[PDB]
Amino acid sequence: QAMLIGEIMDLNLKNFLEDREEIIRDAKRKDEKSFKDFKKIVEEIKERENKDKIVCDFTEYNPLHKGHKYALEKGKEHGIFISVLPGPLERSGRGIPYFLNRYIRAEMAIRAGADIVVEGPPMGIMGSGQYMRCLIKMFYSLGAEIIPRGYIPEKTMEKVIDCINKGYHIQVKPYKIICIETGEILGEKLNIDNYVIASMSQMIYKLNREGLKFNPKFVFVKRLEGISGTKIREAIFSGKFEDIKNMLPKTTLSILKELYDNGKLNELILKRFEDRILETANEYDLYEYLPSNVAEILEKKRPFNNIEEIKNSLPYGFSRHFRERILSKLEARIPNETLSKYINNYPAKIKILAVK
Numbered sequence: 001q002a003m004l005i006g007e008i009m010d011l012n013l014k015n016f017l018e019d020r021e022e023i024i025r026d027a028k029r030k031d032e033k034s035f036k037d038f039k040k041i042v043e044e045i046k047e048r049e050n051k052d053k054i055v056c057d058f059t060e061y062n063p064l065h066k067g068h069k070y071a072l073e074k075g076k077e078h079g080i081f082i083s084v085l086p087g088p089l090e091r092s093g094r095g096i097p098y099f100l101n102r103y104i105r106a107e108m109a110i111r112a113g114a115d116i117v118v119e120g121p122p123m124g125i126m127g128s129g130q131y132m133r134c135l136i137k138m139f140y141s142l143g144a145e146i147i148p149r150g151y152i153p154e155k156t157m158e159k160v161i162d163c164i165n166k167g168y169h170i171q172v173k174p175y176k177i178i179c180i181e182t183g184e185i186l187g188e189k190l191n192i193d194n195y196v197i198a199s200m201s202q203m204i205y206k207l208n209r210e211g212l213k214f215n216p217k218f219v220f221v222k223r224l225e226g227i228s229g230t231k232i233r234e235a236i237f238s239g240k241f242e243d244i245k246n247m248l249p250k251t252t253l254s255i256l257k258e259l260y261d262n263g264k265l266n267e268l269i270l271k272r273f274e275d276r277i278l279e280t281a282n283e284y285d286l287y288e289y290l291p292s293n294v295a296e297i298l299e300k301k302r303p304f305n306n307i308e309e310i311k312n313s314l315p316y317g318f319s320r321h322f323r324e325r326i327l328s329k330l331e332a333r334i335p336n337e338t339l340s341k342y343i344n345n346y347p348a349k350i351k352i353l354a355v356k
Helices: 002-028 032-049 066-076 102-112 128-142 155-165 192-209 229-237 241-247 250-261 274-283 292-301 307-313 320-332 336-344
Strands: 054-058 080-085 116-119 146-151 170-173 176-179 185-187 217-222 352-355
Touching: 002 336, 032 080, 032 116, 032 128, 032 352, 054 066, 054 128, 066 080, 066 102, 066 146, 066 217, 080 102, 080 128, 102 116, 102 250, 102 352, 128 192, 128 336, 146 192, 155 170, 155 176, 155 185, 155 192, 155 217, 170 192, 192 217, 229 241, 241 250, 274 307, 274 320, 292 307, 307 320
Parallel strands: 054 080, 054 146, 080 116, 146 217
Antiparallel strands: 116 352, 170 176, 176 185
């Protein structure tokens, strides 16, 4: 096993470093042909499926559980299904490594029914407003007409859905979920899994105000369960895959069970390159990779011996996402200039991870 663990580690690093180069190229150039190539693929798929509409969703599929597959299949009743599956650097909406790489997650998506899987943005080095702006821009660029989203039912979600179904949009403030156009306060809070819908709605409103002509229709899929991806991943990391199998569809188990049965799954689980993080924290001009205030604080307190000391050196009271984003930035070494450019030019290309 030592040689195999080494190959896997080397591949993870090489993939990470190729991703970084990809981000740097996309910051400076649009690949116009990829957009034309995508358009041709969609036309062909629509022809074959006898469907006229493009259905898109933001899908981490980390891993793809029964609720995800249910939502996907319901989405497909409305058109061809495109999974927008992040992303370069393999750092997630939570700021952290994905459980498995995106090629594996894309194969989960195709097996579950996705017609096309498009590579999503490098989520983990962005704030959540930044990555949501990117996601909506990708949906626009793909020609998305329907967004089929799974939700956890609750009384505030009834009112959110009523607001959206009237053609209105959601704003989120602390302890307020608002129907922007009517001003109505719909409730104080959503289930944590439901904030993605509110966030998408709010960003669509913002981008429309800024001139983006984009008005997709949401299709809401009431989930039959409250499966938590965090809990699924913790069980698998702890060696308790067998305890959570029942929450995963056979199409996801068709990949995971063989790996697990053969003692190969654990080794594939992605983790941080902590040496890179320490090397950037200790040796680089932190002002070119991090925000000023953070660059100042960490530069004062260095050198650090470990990630924990970096984390504890960060300003007090800021969010877990913030701390994980800083770590991902230290890890990725993408200059602020080039990330800004990346976000402003996004999407620079449509990369197809997999197609049915």
